[PDB]
Ligand binder design. Structure first.
Ligand SMILES: NC(=O)c1ccc[n+]([C@@H]2O[C@H](COP(=O)([O-])OP(=O)(O)OC[C@H]3O[C@@H](n4cnc5c(N)ncnc54)[C@H](O)[C@@H]3O)[C@@H](O)[C@H]2O)c1
Ligand SMILES: NC(=O)c1ccc[n+]([C@@H]2O[C@H](COP(=O)([O-])OP(=O)(O)OC[C@H]3O[C@@H](n4cnc5c(N)ncnc54)[C@H](O)[C@@H]3O)[C@@H](O)[C@H]2O)c1
Lengths: 452, 452
């Protein structure tokens, strides 16, 4: 075989471009819950069998397949990728890898156990920018880094939404039940899909899922990060079902092993989104935009400051100097899609992993999705202390409760303001947190077990 | 110590409580543009003459008066206060003192020149919390302070509004033209007044004017701040007519003279609003809410960290120490209103200033309203350098521009997102900045000249 047999799952949007990148291989089956939105894609590949439920497609065609591309809404990435991998299939899974920390940990351990090739779809990991960021840091060009600031201008779509009140009929071209997948059932509405799932906690991850995997990748790889020890967030109005218009997250990562030319001390990483930006770094010329391609990253080293854009693009040092550092990272010639295909075909003993192999991308996505935890737990009024190995917070009190705003009810009558707002009934904070870290799947939807 | 003859201007909201605080004096005339909203207040003082235009009331009654209470929308405070002061009258003017930098500088110099008693309406300046904050700092209890963080949970009303497009008839109880005052004319709508002027750049100052004078007072007086040297801000979606949902501002203030027990080095002050908070200070117990009575302040000293709420309330030290520091500030026994009345009656040669005398409140309000500048100028992508003496920024390029969003146009059609936005026509940034610092008054409305 020179051609992989690939099944595509979630094809109408980003999946479309990913499949174009994989087109030289064999697209034998395509699954999409929405046969209207995805129609143009099924008709670029007339020969592939059409499905509208991945489980049906898997039962019929996982024999014929080597690999699965997944570009569904975030909340279903895990269950799909896990079923594919446990059947011994290679997987390309769009960023963010999974909806939850637990799901990321599971995909990481499954990739190892079944020895398949994996690729999270953060395509910047395969470009030149990151390679420079890493090589500069590792060669001592900026000294040690105790503080990084990062941001995106996303969200650029409306968030902070309330559950829409009208009921809508489910189009006959849409398999609403399979869209819901393991999440709690709720009535259909177009506000949820296509595309707009990003703002709903049960289905997407807000700006963190939209952008963070692109923005933070050079931070995570360059500073060799693992599990954070602490995290805290704040946001604009935090609703119970929808993510906020803007948020800030501060992580702390412990010291790692030093490298010959650069120490790796404890490091704070700040995240800003929704218009908020870090303060301008000292020495940067007035007027230089910190946003390049949707965001920025600032590494504050003891000898200099390294700044890059989203996707690791166009790194520079604020001193103006251009280093000439030793090359250490594999220089990737294929697209992000095709570099994975290469890996899929090398024997497992011998395999050169692609750039977003889940052995990196898993722990990385756990940082991204921890942003969501921090923000959703902000009313606990504490720095949250994370035990990474055991996937729990250690300092949420037994009797703490958490509630969220359902709807802002501000009104003015004849000049007199009223500040009403509905709140959810307080729930136990530890159980709410535990459930965000690891969801209770709706009956009929099951993850494979954690190995061992 | 007979009774002051007081005129009131802007009486239907806050003015109502302020008049209650002054009621043992003679309320001889009241002016309000809105005779429906303000009716209950006119009828608590049936012997005062009623007016709906301050200029009319001043031409008839400034002879008879000693003092004027101003609690109008922000954009009219300065012209009213200034006309009163130039006639030799004492003034109580609600926070924020003025809409603009220039107007604050003018009210400051008029107060000195005419030797009248003044009081900005930040009533926290007369309570005990700030005395403790100041006394602890000045006695060296927390060492030197290089960093302060501050915030409020406001706005708790909707901002980010677009100009309404419907035609609304002017109620016959409303003097819309006198509401506009020196601002640019626009069509009437109830969205602007009463109360809701706060989020419109032409009339209010957003969360900064609603809360900052309350929150930052202990910072400004405790660290003996004057003019900042630098400022920068970011926000959620910055619109052309309405303030954003949330914002951050960083000020830098230069070193002042040291006091015997505490040095006064260069200090950075941060401001956050609309849900955003500063990261939790090191040492603060888990669970302790940083918001007390609407926000909070954190002073990071070399020896300890001092935290207070809004209004300077309930100051404490993170180490748990409670100092016993020498008393230095006058212990104010009368209300914030009546402490001003006392000052009004002392001869100017002898006068003990009330706690929000414009000699402090003027420069303080300049910091507040500088936050508005920073946010409205954020597209310049630079830390702005402020020359306080000359009321100008020194590093805005002569050909730079500013454009703002008029209306977000996001929509989804058949799952495809479209991201359009209308923008204003770019204007020259120096002219735009100069105009925010010093408004061009609408024809027929003039300030007194700056004294020298
Ligand atoms: N790498 C990048 O640059 C990038 C860019 C855009 C999107 N993404 C990611 O790709 C994913 C998809 O987002 P999008 O913008 O393509 O969204 P979208 O909703 O436009 O397209 C998703 C498609 O998947 C289908 N789908 C959803 N759930 C399904 C399920 N359970 N089974 C089968 N089909 C299902 C939908 O019907 C739709 O056609 C998200 O993970 C998003 O984070 C990555
Ligand atoms: N010190 C505090 O704690 C505190 C609390 C609330 C309000 N404020 C301040 O008080 C001021 C008033 O705000 P508010 O909430 O009372 O607003 P409001 O709109 O409820 O009341 C303002 C009143 O003044 C009238 N008014 C407006 N412009 C006028 C003008 N040019 N001439 C005459 N009357 C006019 C309005 O009709 C209304 O009666 C604002 O500057 C606000 O910052 C201070």
């Amino acid at each position: 075989s020179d051609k992989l047999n690939i099944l595509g799952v979630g094809i109408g949007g980003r999946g479309s471009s990913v499949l174009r990148g994989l087109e030289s291989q064999n697209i034998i089956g395509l699954c999409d819950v929405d046969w209207k939105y995805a129609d143009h894609v099924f008709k670029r590949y007339p020969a592939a069998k059409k499905y509208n439920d991945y489980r049906k497609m898997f039962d019929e065609m996982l024999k014929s397949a080597d690999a699965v591309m997944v570009a569904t809404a975030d909340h279903t990435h895990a269950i799909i990728a896990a079923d594919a991998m446990t059947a011994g299939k290679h997987v390309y899974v769009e960023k963010p890898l999974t909806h939850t920390v637990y799901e990321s940990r599971l995909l990481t351990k499954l990739a190892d156990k079944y020895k398949v090739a994996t690729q999270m779809g953060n395509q910047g990991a395969s470009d030149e920018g990151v390679r420079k960021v890493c090589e500069w840091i590792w060669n001592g060009e900026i000294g040690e880094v105790r503080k990084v600031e990062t941001f995106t201008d996303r969200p650029i779509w409306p968030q902070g939404l309330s559950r829409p009140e009208d009921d809508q009929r489910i189009p006959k071209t849409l398999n609403w039940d399979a869209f819901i997948g393991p999440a709690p059932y709720r009535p259909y509405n177009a506000i949820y899909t296509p595309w707009n799932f990003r703002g709903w906690w049960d289905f997407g991850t807000g700006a963190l899922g939209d952008m963070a995997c692109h923005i933070l990748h050079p931070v995570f790889k360059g500073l060799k990060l693992g599990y954070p020890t602490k995290v805290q967030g704040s946001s604009t109005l935090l609703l119970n079902e929808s993510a906020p218009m803007a948020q800030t997250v501060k992580f702390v990562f412990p010291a790692r092993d030093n490298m010959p030319k650069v120490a790796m001390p404890e490091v704070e990483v700040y995240w800003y989104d929704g218009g908020l930006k870090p303060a301008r770094p000292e020495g940067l010329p007035a007027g230089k935009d910190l946003n390049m391609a949707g965001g920025g990253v600032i590494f504050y080293g003891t000898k200099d400051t390294l700044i890059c854009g989203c996707y690791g693009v166009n790194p520079y040092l604020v001193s103006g100097r251009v280093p000439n550092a030793p090359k250490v990272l594999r220089e990737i010639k294929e697209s992000h899609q095709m570099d994975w295909v290469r890996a899929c075909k090398e024997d497992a003993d011998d395999r050169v992993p692609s750039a977003s192999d889940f052995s990196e991308a898993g722990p990385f996505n756990e940082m991204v999705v921890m942003g969501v935890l921090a923000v959703r737990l902000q009313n606990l009024n504490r720095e949250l202390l994370w035990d990474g190995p055991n996937m729990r917070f250690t300092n949420i009190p037994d009797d703490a409760t958490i509630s969220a705003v359902i709807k802002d009810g501000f009104h003015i009558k004849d000049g007199h303001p009223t500040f009403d707002k509905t709140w959810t009934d307080p729930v136990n904070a530890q159980q709410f947190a535990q459930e965000l870290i690891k969801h209770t799947y709706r009956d009929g939807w099951k993850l494979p077990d954690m190995p061992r």
